[PDB]
Design a protein around this ligand. Structure first.
Ligand code: CA
Ligand code: CA
Length: 109
């Protein structure tokens, strides 16, 4: 979904910016990849891409592999990057990310 939804050149730019281990910031990533200005309806389509097992939530293991939803060659996130992303996104503290939490995170910038 993500690569159909989003500009190829945006994706390359976003992935380039977070190449170095430790450099992933969700706010910067969302802005560069082009998710920031997208409608809730369209952000939902990206969410479903990241929700690999179709559970309805992005749980921690899926967050670690978030970059592979944008490029198959996307690196894993580090433990710290994963924890930082999870803490920012998981608004209710239940350990995983629901759609409405994801929507809010994308648009809170
Ligand atoms: Ca899931
Ligand atoms: Ca949650």
């Amino acid at each position: 979904a993500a690569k159909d939804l989003l500009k190829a050149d945006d994706i390359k730019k976003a992935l380039d910016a977070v190449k170095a281990e430790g450099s992933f910031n969700h706010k910067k990533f969302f802005a560069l990849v082009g998710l920031k200005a997208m409608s809730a309806n369209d952000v939902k389509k990206v969410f479903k891409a990241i929700d690999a097992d179709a559970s309805g939530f992005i749980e921690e293991e899926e967050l670690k592999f978030v970059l592979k939803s944008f490029a198959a060659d996307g690196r894993d996130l580090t433990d710290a990057e994963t924890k930082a992303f999870l803490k920012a996104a998981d608004k209710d503290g239940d350990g995983k990310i629901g759609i409405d939490e994801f929507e809010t995170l994308v648009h809170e910038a």
